[PDB]
Structures are given as structure tokens and as C-alpha cells.
Design an enzyme around this catalytic site. Sequence first.
Site, short mmCIF file in Angstrom:
data_model
loop_
_atom_site.label_atom_id
_atom_site.label_comp_id
_atom_site.label_asym_id
_atom_site.label_seq_id
_atom_site.Cartn_x
_atom_site.Cartn_y
_atom_site.Cartn_z
N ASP A 48 -49.45 2.46 43.28
CA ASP A 48 -50.36 1.32 43.27
C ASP A 48 -51.80 1.80 43.45
OD1 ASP A 48 -51.33 -1.24 43.20
OD2 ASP A 48 -50.11 -1.99 44.87
C1 LIG Z 1 -60.21 -4.30 62.74
C2 LIG Z 1 -60.48 -4.70 61.29
C3 LIG Z 1 -60.00 -6.12 61.00
C4 LIG Z 1 -59.90 -6.42 59.51
C5 LIG Z 1 -59.44 -7.85 59.25
C6 LIG Z 1 -59.15 -8.11 57.77
C7 LIG Z 1 -57.71 -8.54 57.54
C8 LIG Z 1 -57.26 -8.27 56.11
C9 LIG Z 1 -56.50 -9.44 55.50
C10 LIG Z 1 -56.89 -9.65 54.04
C11 LIG Z 1 -55.97 -10.61 53.30
C12 LIG Z 1 -55.89 -10.24 51.82
O1 LIG Z 1 -55.13 -9.40 51.46
S1 LIG Z 1 -56.95 -11.08 50.62
C13 LIG Z 1 -56.09 -11.15 49.02
C14 LIG Z 1 -57.12 -11.13 47.89
N1 LIG Z 1 -56.54 -11.56 46.63
C15 LIG Z 1 -55.60 -10.70 45.94
O2 LIG Z 1 -55.31 -9.64 46.40
C16 LIG Z 1 -54.99 -11.12 44.61
C17 LIG Z 1 -54.81 -9.99 43.60
N2 LIG Z 1 -54.90 -8.74 44.34
C18 LIG Z 1 -55.59 -7.58 43.81
O3 LIG Z 1 -56.10 -7.63 42.74
C19 LIG Z 1 -55.65 -6.30 44.64
O4 LIG Z 1 -56.73 -5.52 44.22
C20 LIG Z 1 -54.35 -5.49 44.54
C21 LIG Z 1 -53.44 -6.02 43.44
C22 LIG Z 1 -53.62 -5.57 45.88
C23 LIG Z 1 -54.68 -4.03 44.25
O5 LIG Z 1 -54.72 -3.87 42.86
P1 LIG Z 1 -54.48 -2.37 42.22
O6 LIG Z 1 -53.20 -2.35 41.43
O7 LIG Z 1 -55.63 -2.02 41.31
O8 LIG Z 1 -54.40 -1.35 43.34
#
Ligand SMILES: CCCCCCCCCCCC(=O)SCCNC(=O)CCNC(=O)[C@H](O)C(C)(C)COP(=O)(O)O
Lengths: 175, 84, 124, 70, 128, 459, 104, 88, 274, 63, 178
Positions: free
Chosen positions: H43
Site C-alpha cells: 500500500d
Molecule cells: C499524537 C498525534 C495525534 C494524531 C491524531 C490524528 C488521528 C488520525 C485519524 C485520521 C482518520 C482518517 O483516517 S481520515 C480518512 C481520510 N479519507 C480517506 O482516507 C479516503 C480515501 N483514502 C486515501 O486516499 C488514503 O490516501 C489511502 C487510501 C489510505 C492511502 O492511499 P495509497 O494507496 O496511495 O497509499
Amino acid sequence: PDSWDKDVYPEPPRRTPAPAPQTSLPNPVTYLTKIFDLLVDRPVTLAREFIEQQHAKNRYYYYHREFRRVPDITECEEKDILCMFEAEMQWRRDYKVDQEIVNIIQERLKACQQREGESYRQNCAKELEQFTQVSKAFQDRYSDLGAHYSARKCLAKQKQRMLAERKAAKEAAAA
Amino acid sequence: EHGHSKMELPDYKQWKIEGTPLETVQEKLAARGLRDPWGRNEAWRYSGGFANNVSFVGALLKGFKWGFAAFVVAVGAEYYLESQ
Amino acid sequence: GAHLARRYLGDASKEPDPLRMPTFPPDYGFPERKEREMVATQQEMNDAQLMLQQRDYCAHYLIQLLKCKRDSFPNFLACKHEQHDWDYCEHLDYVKRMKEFERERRLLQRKKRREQREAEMARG
Amino acid sequence: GGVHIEPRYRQFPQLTRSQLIQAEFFSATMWFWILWRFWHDSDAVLGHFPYPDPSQWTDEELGILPDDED
Amino acid sequence: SFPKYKPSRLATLPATLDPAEYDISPETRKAQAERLAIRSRLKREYLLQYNDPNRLGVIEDPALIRWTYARSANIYPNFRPTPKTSLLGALFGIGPLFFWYYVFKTDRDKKEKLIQEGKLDQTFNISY
Amino acid sequence: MLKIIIPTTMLLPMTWMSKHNMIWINATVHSLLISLISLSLLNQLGENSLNFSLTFFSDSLSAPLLVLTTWLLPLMLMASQSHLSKETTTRKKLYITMLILLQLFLIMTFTATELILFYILFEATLVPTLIIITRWGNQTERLNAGLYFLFYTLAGSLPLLVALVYIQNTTGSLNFLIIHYWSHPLSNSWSNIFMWLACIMAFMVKMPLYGLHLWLPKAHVEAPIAGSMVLAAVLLKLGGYGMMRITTILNPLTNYMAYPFLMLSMWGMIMTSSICLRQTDLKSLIAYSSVSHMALVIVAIMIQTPWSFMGATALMIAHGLTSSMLFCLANTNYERVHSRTMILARGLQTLLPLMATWWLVASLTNLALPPSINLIGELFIITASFSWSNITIILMGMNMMITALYSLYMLITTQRGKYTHHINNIKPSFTRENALMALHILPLLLLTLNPKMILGPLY
Amino acid sequence: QQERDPWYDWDHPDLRLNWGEPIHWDLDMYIRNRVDTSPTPVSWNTMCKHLFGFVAFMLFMFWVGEIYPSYQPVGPKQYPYNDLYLERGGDPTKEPEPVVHYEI
Amino acid sequence: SDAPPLTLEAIKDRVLYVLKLYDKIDPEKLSVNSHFMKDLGLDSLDQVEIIMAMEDEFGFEIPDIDAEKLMCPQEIVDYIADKKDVYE
Amino acid sequence: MTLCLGAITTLFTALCAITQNDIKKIVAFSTSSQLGLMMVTIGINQPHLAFLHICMHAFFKAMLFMCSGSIIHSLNDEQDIRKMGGLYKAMPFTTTALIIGSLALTGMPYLTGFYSKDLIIEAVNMSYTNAWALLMTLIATSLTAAYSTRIIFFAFLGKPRFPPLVLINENNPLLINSIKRLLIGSIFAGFIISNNIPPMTVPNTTMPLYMKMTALIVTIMGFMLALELNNTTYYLKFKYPSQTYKFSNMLGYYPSIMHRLPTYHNLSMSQKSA
Amino acid sequence: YRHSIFAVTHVLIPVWIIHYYLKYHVTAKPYTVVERKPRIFPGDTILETGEVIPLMKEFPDQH
Amino acid sequence: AFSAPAAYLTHQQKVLRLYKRALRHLESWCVHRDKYRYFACLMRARFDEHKNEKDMVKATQLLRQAEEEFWYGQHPQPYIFPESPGGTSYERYECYKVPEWCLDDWHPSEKAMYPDYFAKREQWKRLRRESWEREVKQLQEETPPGGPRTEALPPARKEGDLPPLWWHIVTRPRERPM
Ligand SMILES: CCCCCCCCCCCC(=O)SCCNC(=O)CCNC(=O)[C@H](O)C(C)(C)COP(=O)(O)O
Ligand SMILES: CCCCCCCCCCCCCCCCCC(=O)OC[C@H](COP(=O)([O-])OCC(O)COP(=O)([O-])OC[C@@H](COC(=O)CCCCCCCCCCCCCCCCC)OC(=O)CCCCCCCCCCCCCCCCC)OC(=O)CCCCCCCCCCCCCCCCC
Ligand SMILES: CCCCCCCCCCCCCCCCC[C@@H](O)O[C@H](CO[C@H](O)CCCCCCCCCCCCCCC)COP(=O)(O)OCC[N+](C)(C)C
Ligand SMILES: CCCCCCCC/C=C\CCCCCCCC(=O)O[C@H](COC(=O)CCCCCCC/C=C/CCCCCCCC)COP(=O)(O)OCCN
């Protein structure tokens, strides 16, 4: 040393306790002073003696300049320039000598505090009394004259002081 | 004169999660349905001379045994020398 | 601490103020009033030039200690007895100060008790 | 001015016996010093002169009368 | 939900907390493309002048010259006496002088009165 | 006194009949000799003065200024040798002629036993400097600068002339010795107020006093290197010397007429220092630092105490030397980069290390590090002002802090950091520039060993 | 200018500037050696409140401690010769009134 | 310092050593020129974790813009070698 | 004024120290706290005691910085304590010297810090001063123990956390001899100097038993509390920080505000008005 | 060998110069070097004069 | 650094960047390795729960509350590598970097030492002199009209050609010159 007068720069008799050591242990201070003497004082003394002989081979003299007395500003005409010039030069010389008198008294005071040690407050009372008197007299003579001081301004200050004193004395007597 | 000695890396099959806190971590992860893919990358931190730890009190008493032995010997010598 | 709590949380007039101590005449308690004696004269206690704050009733022991420290120089652990004697004298002086504080506190107590008794008698 | 020691790459580094014996020696002398000073000079930590109890003092030496005389 | 971050003048808003970067429109994409285009044109100009073996000396920057000229020589011709300019100039140019004059005059008056009455204790005060 | 004046005059025929390629060598050698000869004036008396004749006299306030004036000319010749290489022989001889004329006028100004003669020469110094500024200046603003530098000056000193002649119709003389010996108090009157103003304003405009300083950044930025050296080092001190000379006849009015200026100075020294924090030009930064230091000297002279005057004399000498050094260093940078902007050429300690050392020494001297004579002057003035009124220390203290800031700022911006990538014409420093820096700095550190030689007639 | 991109290829990597781009009016104010405006973990107003509150609380408590000092249940220190009259300042001709210490 | 002058072979050995300790990738299939997304079926998140692992391995960190376009072990080795100025 | 300034300095700086991650920053805040203690001593009218404390702090603080530099150089110029793990065994000489220096700094009996700090605390307890300054001094003593605990625990006890290429090496005579001389100093100089100088003040001969032992009590309490709080970091629980931690970690917010509010408002004026 | 030459040209020569300068130039002027007066205790004797300082008044000695 | 930037960052890049930052700050909060491994796997699992989401609006509404959550719990003192733009040795060696052209100003007595090095330097100078004249024309013909749209350069396409604008990339001083 004879290079300076002992009466102008007085000093107490400098009594030092005899050294008696309770402990047999050989202290390092005595041995260190013996090596310091042998390695430093003897060669330095020889060099100084050689220099002193070379100086005694060629002896010559210099003298302290004597200045006559001149009428001061109190007996000069209003616009007579020569008498004012002589009186002003004399007043400046007196001012310099006054500064050096204060310097001498301060030096005695500074030296005494260090010499006395932890008992300076009681011991230096006599020296302090002398500096108080000399500083008061000097302050009366030369304070607040400014950068452009002269004999005329010192005389004016003295005249105003004398007028104030005479008025105060008359007021107290006539009170 | 520098360190040119051709240092050779160990075998990667040597590192195992077993016997380390990483195994406990993997258990707590599998109880949720997850896995740690990098568990074998950090195994070297618990393998060699790094396996045995020292406590804080154990650290403070670094030289207590020999110091106490020397102190006892010196006290015995002083007692036997004064009582003469 | 206990005196701090007693004075700052209780009756301030009940306990002495260290800045104005003592508030009662020295002969109020008993008329004997033995004097405090010194051993060191003015001049020798000046020549030793201890310090103004080291110039107290314990000065003779300090002078003996300094004589030791000067004579047995290379071995800095020879004269320990004189250190102990000077410490004992300072301890006795501090105990005397504590006795003075306690006497002032008890005298204030008895004075306030007498005042309350006189007030009660005058009322009744 | 030292000796040649190579890196280890994920193993415990090489140690000379001299540094080990030196560290052990110096910790040993520190602990011996603490114990020796405690034995010979114990008053520096626990005190030497007892603290008197002000309440235990009798009223006679305190210069106090039984609330009637003065 | 977590407490909000409040930006200030000397602690600005992070880029990742900007609402603007999430409201994406084709106009904004066109704007960003144009900014990259002009930046790359300037970079190409500078790099062409920078890698020249023939070139010696300093690559004159029109931006730097504009900055220095604007800060120094362009102020007065664009100056207009307005209520804001007049009030700020009068304040910042007259107020401090009168404040310090009042302070020093008052201090010297009190000192002079004390000296005339005689109670100042200038013992040992010789050098002035 | 003619033993210094006559060789300075023979410098002109020597220059004008020299070979085309030997003018610099001859001028430098003979200027150094005249400086050595003038050094004998330092032997002064605690009494009246060295009255040579009816026309010229020397004192322990005039002697250090004369020595500095004679010593500065070889430095100006060394600095000017570079940017005049492509210039015809006649014009180079005219440049050297301008410098020689300026030195002769300054020498005759600092002795000047009479006040109208002093006025005449003090005003004669305007012409050679105006020609130097407006003729051998690089930028188009030089003309404007020259105008400012002229008219300000004259607007201040044209009333003074009138005042002077008025004095001679009431006193009967303008000889300084007779003026000192027959001095009389000034009654508190409107006529006497305006006479005080006429006597003081001419030297306040050339100090410069805060608010009358506008000509100074222009003239210092737009002048050639020798022009900047002489404006910063010597010409600013004409006002100090004149105000020291003329305040003998203004008392006791000075006690209360000094208030408007003192504030203007005490607050001024802050504002100008603050200006140096946000400056995009090196020459402008150095000029504003000059304004701040001269404001401190003004405060000293207006306080009128022995410590004030000793501090003012020391600070005038020290500031002359340090400002000249800073201007020379900035010019060395400018000759390589041609920009005169502080932020363009950076990280020069990597490319020119010895010049970085020179920069550090000049900045430290400006920053008033003890026991340099800069700090001797500043400390004496601070002590005298403290005795004047205890609150002054506040302003004084602030200025000290601010000064350090901008000084080190100027040192960190240009010497430290990463070099500019696209500037590849930074040649190694020549022997001429390093010799110039050494000749600027060594006399300062030598003078800190014998401070009484610069502490004035009240020592 | 501390908050520009540190990983971009600036023409002036120390100043973080590009050749030819417009220069801010107050560049000499923000040069990474001077005032920066980069965002902080905690908001500016909260930082101000906490710093001011801590300082004010400490000042008030120091004043309270001045009002309510700490000491020992002891009397004043006693010095022999009229409270060391001659060794502290002196005046041997004034015959100062005698103070006699109490023995308890 | 006394830091050994790491070489190209050292960089390649360390990169492959770190990759083999990633259990998500089979040690047999992995080659120096094997792509990440297509040849190993990994990935994008797997790629970023790989980059962080290399960062923690070599003691310096790679900017996100450069890191996001490193898709083979060979070009990771090339990036590290160019960053650290490796001759041979 | 001197006493109050010293008290607030020592408290504030120790409080900031207990939560830092850079080893040099921890030692710097330790130095500032010790200077605050010296000024507290000056305030209660004990100058010779303050001079003695200067003399002993020289020894043990200098050697502590020696050890910090040894670690930093041996871990390839890494200064954060998050990335140094088990150095108790990997570097024994460095470990032993540091343990000794931390024991001396925290006033372990009969060490170079004892003969100054113990007397400082005794003199502050039995004098006519603020209650607040006394309390701040005691809390500063506890926090001193706390950050010494933090240094030792986070740099010498756990599992290694540095990069795989191990380059640890003390085996250089210069480093060893330079450290060992100051080690001997920070063990014995206290006894030597104290017994060689003359009595320069009146001692505190009689003290309440609890008041004589207060310094040891507060030091041991700080040790225990900091150890217990550090031992909870191994737990598999993760929580966001509180407001007090953020206040102490960002240095009371003093460097932020004061290096942005005044400077700006100065420089702005310097261009806009002046 | 190196330590011998170092101690000769870096310690002996400066101490010689300083000792000469102090003994024959600085001392020649008054009050240049002022030494703290040495302590005198009950029971010492003075080299210059020889008088013995009388002992103290035999304080009651116990513990 | 080396790579030319783009006009904008896509949602994919923003999500990846937030993932990297969150992992680094978790590592800073979780000092020990096993605890960090546990919570990093937890964060990854919590991170890919919305991996298969399709609509843009809710995906952009995510990564926003995620970023606010990051900013709330962002560890005011995170770990920075020593050479990174925040580390304790970020620009420690920038005072030892001297340009190559300085060697042109060396005295011939200095250049007498190292004769082989300066022979090689002169060969490099000649190579640059030819390559620049070729490069200018290559860049002129290859560039689109109206100016470049990105600051990315083309490689060398002929046999003897060199990449345009190569002199000041090839001759960097070094990472640690001294
Ligand atoms: C101490 C620090 C605290 C931090 C707090 C933050 C908590 C984090 C929680 C975030 C929640 C989420 O995931 S927010 C979710 C945002 N929306 C999506 O992920 C929809 C489609 N996803 C993508 O396109 C991605 O890039 C992906 C496919 C995974 C990679 O693609 P690749 O195939 O190119 O690797
Ligand atoms: C007289 C009787 C004698 C007996 C007395 C009693 C005996 C002992 C009782 C103990 C009492 C408390 C001691 C424990 C301290 C708390 C430690 C703790 O648990 O911290 C975790 C906890 C949060 O931890 P976290 O968020 O999870 O941290 C994330 C990780 O852990 C990140 O962690 P990390 O790995 O990065 O680093 C860990 C670090 C990071 O942890 C921290 O954040 C530290 C911050 C708290 C510690 C500070 C304690 C010192 C207090 C002095 C303050 C003076 C007053 C200031 C005034 C401020 C005004 C606003 O913590 C430590 O290293 C150890 C902390 C200190 C322990 C060692 C010393 C404690 C003993 C000394 C104190 C008492 C003994 C004095 C001796 C003398 C006898 C009197 O901290 C707190 O919650 C604070 C608790 C108490 C703070 C009170 C102040 C609040 C003020 C709010 C406003 C109040 C109103 C004001 C009005 C004003 C209007 C103008
Ligand atoms: C531009 C940047 C600065 C450059 C230099 C500026 C400094 C010049 C300041 C000149 C010094 C002060 C001028 C007059 C001082 C006299 C004192 C007077 O002002 O105070 C009161 C005087 O009262 C009133 O001020 C009278 C004058 C009022 C008219 C003057 C205009 C006021 C503001 C003008 C300022 C313009 C300056 C620039 C002109 C171009 C005192 O009351 P009084 O007891 O009765 O008079 C005492 C004097 N006696 C005894 C000789 C009679
Ligand atoms: C860079 C700008 C500086 C400009 C200079 C500002 C200073 C102006 C000083 C005043 C100018 C005239 C000076 C007077 C000459 C001195 C001689 C003198 O004082 O004699 C007085 C005469 O004094 C005068 O006449 C002065 C009158 C003023 C007229 C000109 C006004 C010019 C403007 C004055 C206001 C500005 C002053 C301060 C400006 C500060 C700088 C901006 C006595 O005259 P008698 O009648 O013989 O004796 C009286 C008994 N029967």
C-alpha cells in the site's frame, strides 16, 4: 624604605606573633618559602646589586622647583591684566596642591581599612575624622565652581559665605 | 589510522520476537484482530547485552559491596590498632 | 514550628513579638539577677579581630580554637576538642535564648490571666 | 590515544576490562568514603546537642510567681 | 471535540487549520497553477543567469532595489498631511520631550530646595 | 605653530610638481612626517596655554584634535587611492589639493586665538568639502546632499557672526584669553537670551543636534570615502570645540537655557539609536550612530562640569577614530559589491577572515568595551549626568543597551551566516586595506594606555 | 520568515528567499534572527493568561510571606559591651547608657 | 566523530536488511530492483512506514516530497548515497 | 529583594527542568536553580556559605556537563534523551561518574554538595525570613532530586533506543583522566575545604530533630515521587497532556511572549515612528 | 626535558621579573602593597619587641 | 528538497503527510519501543477504517477533525533529527562551506601545491565551457512558449550533451567539508 617620608605616611609598629608549632608535622609553607628564597630572591638581589653599582658609577641630581609668592586676586585692580594673570596662575597651583593633599589623606584612609582587617570600624575612626575635615574644607573651597572656574569665582563664593556667616552671627547675637 | 575493518552484518533470521515485550504487544494486538509487521525489526533491542536491566536502586548502589568490605576491613584495623 | 501556628491562627497578643522582646523588666521575676560574665577583654578580642557578629559571650572558646587552627596547621584534624567546646558554648547560649522566649511567653500568659481575673472581679 | 574498537551493528559494543575495573573502583571508594565518614562523624547528620523541651522547664528557674505576688 | 486554537498577530494560524485550503474550486486551482508558473519563470531566469560561465559579479535583483528604494526614497513624495499623520507625529515627536522636561525640572527643583534649606548631607561629595 | 602650517602649505607645490605616477607616494610620506612633527604639541602645561604668538595658541583641548587632524590625511589618501585609478592626473592633483586645503583650514581653526579668525576658518572648511562631495560623488543625490550640507550650516552660523561683532562692540575684544579673564555674568534678559541662542546655534547645527541632523545622513552617504572620513572624524568636532570655547561668556544663562537642548539630546540619543535597528544601508547606519554619540557629547558640554568636559574630549577623539574605521570597512565592501546594502553580501567571515577580525574590533570599540577610551568618555559623561539628575541614568542605560544591539546586528548581518551564492567577485583583501585598518585601530588601543593625553584642559 | 518551507530550494537558503520575488516591507523585522510569528501549540491568549497569573500569584504570596514571616522561639542575640558600642561606629567620648544582659 | 565512511555496498546491505525484517514482504521475492506497489503488492501507507523505518535506520530524515516518490530499494539507496556524498 | 528573587528563580527553573527532553537543557536549568539557591543564601546574610556553595557547584556541575558531552559525542551528536537507552552497561565509566555527580548535586551526606547545601537549608530553616521563600526552597530541593532522577532513568536504565550502528566508545585517556580528576574533587573537596578554612560564622548547634533532617526528607521524597511517575511510562496507556505539563514544558511561556511582544513593538516603532 | 625548559621559560622568568618589579619599584612608593595585620592571640610573643601577651582569665572549664 | 514542487497537494498526499506526522508525534509521546509499536498499530488501524470511503465531501470532512485532533495533542517538544530544520546541528557546518570559485583567486605559490587537482579543475572548466553553450540552445528549443510552467528541467537527450544547468548541482561543497 627612605624613598618616602614616614611622617606623611604613618604606619603602626607592625607586631607579628612568634611562630610556635604544636604539631611536629613539617608544614609545607616553610619549605616552599625556603625554595622560593633560594630560587628567586638571591638572583633578583644579585641583579639589583649589579644595577645599583652601575648606577652609583654615574650619579647626577635633579631639584624640586621652588615658586615665589605673588599677590593674589584680592589685591588686583579691576582691569589690570598682569596682576590678574599672576594671581590666577598662583591660584591654579594652590588648587593642584589642594587636590594632592586630599589625595594623601584618602590614601591613609584606604590603607588603614585594609591594614586593620576585621576591626576597621573602631580602628579607622581617627583617619575618618581627618578625611571628613579635609573633604569639608575642600568642598567649601572649590565645589560648584563649574568647568570655567577661576580665582574670581572662588573669591565670590567665599564672599557670599562670609556674608551669610556674618548675618547668622549678628542674628544669633541680636536674637 | 581509521576504522576500516570490513564489518559484516548478522543474519536476519537471528532476530525473533519471542521472549520480549514485543511478544506481549503482539498478543494484545491479536486480541483485537491486528498484527505488528515491524516486531522483528526492533528485536535486537532485547537480545544481546541489552537483555539484562538494572533497577534505579540497583544503579545507585553500583559499588556498595566492595565499599562495605573495605570499610569493614578498615574499621577492624583501626579498632585493633587503637586497642594496643 | 508550633509557635507560628499559635500566634498567626490564635491570639496574637497571647504570644511574644520577637522584634519587641523583652517587654518586661529583668527583675520582675526574681531579685537575684546574676550577671553574665565574659572572659575575653576588649583589647584581646579586638586583636583576635574575629568579626563583629562573632564577638559574643562565647568568644574565648573561639579564640582558643583559632590558636589551635594556627599552631597545628598541616594536620587540620588535631584540635577537635576546642571546636566541641565552642559548639557547647553556643548551644548553651541558644538554650538561654529559648529560656528567655519561654519566660516572656509565660509572663505574658500570667499578665493576661491577671487582667481577665481583675475584669471578672470588677464586673461581679 | 586509545585503542582500535570496531562498531558492532545491533550487538552490545566491545568493552575493555580497564574501564570496567576503573568504574567499579571509583564507585567503591565513594561508598567506602560515605560509610567511613558516617561512622567517624555521625553528629553531622543526626545532631549532637539535644533540643530541650520548653514545656518541661519548671517555673522556678523561669522567674515566674504563682499569679498573686507581683 | 477539543478546545479550539485561536490565532493571534504573533502566533498565526497553521496551514492545516485553514478553512480556505479545504474549499477547493477550479478557479483556485487555476490561481495556484498561475502562481507556480510565475515562480518557475523567475526561477528559470535566475538559474540561466546563475550558471553562466561568462558571468562575473552580482546578479542585480530588481526586487531588492525596489525594496530599498521604497523603504528609503519613496516615503516623502507619497506623504500627505492627514489627521492620523498629524496627530501621531505631534504625539510621538512632542510628548516625550515635554514629559522628560517635566520630570527633570521637577527633580532638580526639589533637589535645589533641599540644598537651599541645608538638609541634603553632601558629605564627601567632592567630584561633580 | 608655523612649523606645522608651513609644511602643510608646501604640500601643494610638492603635489603639483610631482610625477604623474608618484603623487600618492609623496603625499602620503609627507603627511606622515607632518603628523610626526605635530605630535610635539602634546606636551602641555597645567597652567595657561602654549601661547606661541599674538595669532595662534595651543591647549590640551586643541592638541589632541590637531594631532587627529594631521593623522587623518594619510588615511584618506590611502582610502582614495583605489576608486580614483581611472582618473586624469590633473583631477587627481585637484583632489589631493582639496584634501590639503581642508587640513590647512582645520589646523588654523584649532589654534585661532581670536574668535572672528576662528569663524572665518571654521567657515572656510565648507568649500573644499562641498567640492569633494558634489564633484567626486557616485550617485545623483550628491548634488542635493551638498545643498543640504551647505545651507543648514550657514543658516546656523550667519547669526553667530553678528553676535560676535556685537560682543566686540561691548567688550572691546574677541581674543580668547582676554575673554576668559574679563568674563562677566549674563543677565536674564530677552536680548541676552537671543545672544545666547545666536552663540550656541551655530555649533548645535554642526554637532548635529537632534532635529537639525537631517543633512548628515545625506552628506555622509553621498560623499566619497575620504569625504566621509573627514566629515565623521573631524568636522563634527568643530561644533564641540567651539561650544567648549564660547560657553565661558554665557554663564549663568546656560543654567536654564540648556533645558530645551538637553531633552532634545537625551531623547534624541534614543531615537537615532532605534533608527539603526531598522536600516537597509551601511553608511546610513554608521551616520546615525555618529548622531547618537555626538548627542551624548552635547549633553556633556551643556552640563558644564569638569567631569563632563573630560568625558566630552575623550569621546570626541574616540568617536572620530571609530567612525572613520567603520566607514573605511564599509567602503571596502562596497568596492567589491557596488551596492551599499547590508543584506546583499552576507557571510563574509568565510571569504575574508582578517577583514572579519577588523570588523569585530571596530564594532567592539563602537559598542564601548572597557578599558577603551570610548568607554572612558561615555562613563565620565554618565557620571556627570547622574550628578546633574539621578534619573538620567535611565535614558543613558537604554542608549547603552540599544547601541550594543545595532553594533552586533551590523556584525552578524554581514560577516556571519551563509555566503551569497551568486556573488563570485570577492577578491582577497589587499595589503592597502589591511594597513588602513591597522593604522585606524592601533592608535586607539595605544591611547587607552595614556588617557590623560585626551582628557582635556580640566584634567 | 521562520515559518517558510525549510525544505524548498530557496536561492537564499539562510534568508529563505527566491530571486525576483516581491520582498515584504518588514523583511528586516522577520529574518529568523528576530521576531517570528510561527504558530505555537498553545494559543496566545492562554499563554498570556497563564504567565501573568503565575507571576501575580507569586508576587502576592511573597507579600503574604513578608507579612507572616518564619522564625524560632528564641530571644534576641546578646552582645557584651553595651551591645558592642565601641566596636560598632565608636564615639568613645559620649558615655552611652549601659545595657546589662540577663543571665537565666 | 570517528564515524566510519559508509559506502554504496553498506547502504544497500542496510536497506535490504531493514526490508527483510518487514514481515509483510517475503524475503525470497524481494530484489534490489523490485517495485513496491506492483511487484510486492504493498500500500501507500506501507511505503510511508518503509520510509520512516529507513529514516530511523540511517539517522537522518527524508522530506515528504522526495520520500513519496521512492518506489524501489535501488532508488532509496541512490537517494541516501547522493544525500551523504558517497563515492564508491 | 535578593532572597525573594533567589527563591522564585530556583523554584521556576527547577520546575521547568523536571520536564525537559534535551540533556543540556536539563543541566542548564539545574545550573540556574543552583544559582537561585546561592542568591537565597546571600539574602539570609550568609556570604561565606554562598562562596562555599560556588566552590562545590563548580566541581560537580562541571563534571556533569563532561558526562553529558561524552554521551552526546558517543551517540553521534544526539542530545535528546528519548533516543538514548541502556548506557549503564554499554558505558560504565560515564555511568559511574554521572551517578556520583547526581548524588553530590542532591546533597548526599559527606559529599562535595553536603557541606554547602546542607548548611544552606539549615540556615534558611532557622532564620527570620519569609515563609514563602522557605517553602519555595524546599520544593526546589525536591524538584532537584526529581530531575536528577529523570536524567538517570531516561538515559541509563531502559532498553537501547539509538540507531543500529553502535559507535559507543569511552576508551580515550584524555576523557577518562579529565573526568576522573573532577570525580575525585566532587568526592573529597568538601571535607578538605571545610576542614581547612577558619570559622567564618556562628554555627547552628542545636536544632529540632525533624528540622535537622528536613533536607534529606525532601530529597528522598522527590526521588521516590519522580521514580514512581517515571515508572508509569512503561504502561500500555496513552493520554493527552494536561495544562500544567504544557506550562512547565514550554518554560512558563516566558520565552514565547517576551521574545515576541516587546521586540516586535520595539522594532515596529523603530521604523514607523522614529 | 620539555617540562624542564617549559618550567624555566614560562614560570621562572615571569616570577623573576615580577619579584624584581615588586621588590624594587612598587615597594619604593608608600601604600602600594598593604598587608592585612596578622592576628594576635593571648599567649604569643612578638619578634620585633618580644613582649608576651598575658593569658586569659581561666574560664571555668568543664566539658 | 531535490524534487521540484507541484502547484497543489492532492488529498492523497495530505492524508499521507498527516499519517507521517501523527506517527512521529506518537513516537515522541511513546518513548519506549514496544508501547510505540502497540499504539502505532492502533493508529494505523484507526487510520485505514475510512480507507475505502468514496465520496469526496466526507473524506475532506475527515482529515480536518483529524488535524484539529493532531493540533490538540501535538507534543509541544517533538523529536527532531539533529540535521533536520529543527535539530541541534541543523546548519552546524555551513561556516565550513567555501565555494569552488575561491580557488581561482589562489596565489600561484599556493596552486604550486596540488598540481594534479588544478589540472583536473581546468579539465572540468573546459567541460563546463562547452556544455553551457550546448545547454542554452537545448533549453531554448525544449521550453514551451510563454515561459516554463514548472521548475523541472529536462535531461540530456543527445550523446555528448550534459543535463542543462548542471554545474552548481554537481559542484556542491560537501555535507561535511571539514
Ligand atoms: C499524537 C498525534 C495525534 C494524531 C491524531 C490524528 C488521528 C488520525 C485519524 C485520521 C482518520 C482518517 O483516517 S481520515 C480518512 C481520510 N479519507 C480517506 O482516507 C479516503 C480515501 N483514502 C486515501 O486516499 C488514503 O490516501 C489511502 C487510501 C489510505 C492511502 O492511499 P495509497 O494507496 O496511495 O497509499
Ligand atoms: C508540610 C507537610 C509535608 C508533606 C507535604 C506532602 C508530601 C508530598 C505530597 C505530594 C503533593 C504533590 C506532589 C506530586 C506533584 C504532581 C506530579 C504529577 O502527578 O504530574 C502529573 C500531572 C499531569 O501529568 P501529565 O499531563 O499526564 O504529563 C504527561 C506525561 O506525564 C509527560 O511526562 P514526562 O515523562 O515528560 O515527565 C514527567 C514530569 C512531568 O510532569 C509534570 O507535568 C510536572 C508538573 C507538576 C509537578 C510540580 C510540583 C511542584 C509544585 C510547585 C508549584 C508552586 C506554586 C506555583 C503557583 C502557580 C499559580 C498558577 O513529571 C516529573 O518528572 C515528576 C513531577 C514532580 C514529582 C517530584 C517532586 C514532587 C514533590 C515536591 C512537591 C511537594 C513536596 C514539597 C517538599 C517540601 C514540604 C512542603 O500533573 C498535574 O496534574 C499537576 C498536579 C498538581 C499541580 C498543582 C498546580 C495547579 C495550578 C492550577 C491553578 C490553581 C489556582 C491558582 C490561582 C491563582 C490566581 C492568580
Ligand atoms: C526644530 C528642531 C529643534 C531645533 C532647536 C530648537 C531649540 C530652540 C529653543 C529656544 C530656547 C527657549 C526660548 C525662550 C526661553 C525663555 C524662557 C521662556 O520661554 O519661558 C517663560 C517666558 O514666557 C513666555 O514663554 C514668553 C515667550 C512666549 C512667546 C514664544 C513662543 C512660544 C513657542 C515658540 C517655539 C518656536 C521655536 C522655533 C522657532 C522657528 C518664562 O516666563 P517669564 O518669567 O515671563 O520670562 C522669563 C525670561 N525673562 C526673565 C528674560 C523675561
Ligand atoms: C538651522 C536653523 C538655525 C537658525 C538660527 C536660529 C537662532 C536665531 C538666533 C537669533 C537671531 C538674531 C541674534 C541676535 C544677534 C545677537 C546680538 C544681540 O543679542 O543683541 C541684542 C539684540 O537682540 C535682537 O535684536 C534679536 C531679535 C531677533 C530678531 C530676528 C528673529 C529671528 C528668529 C528668532 C526666533 C527663532 C529662535 C530659535 C530658533 C531655533 C532654531 C530653529 C540686544 O540689542 P540692543 O538693542 O542693542 O540692546 C538692548 C538694550 N537696549
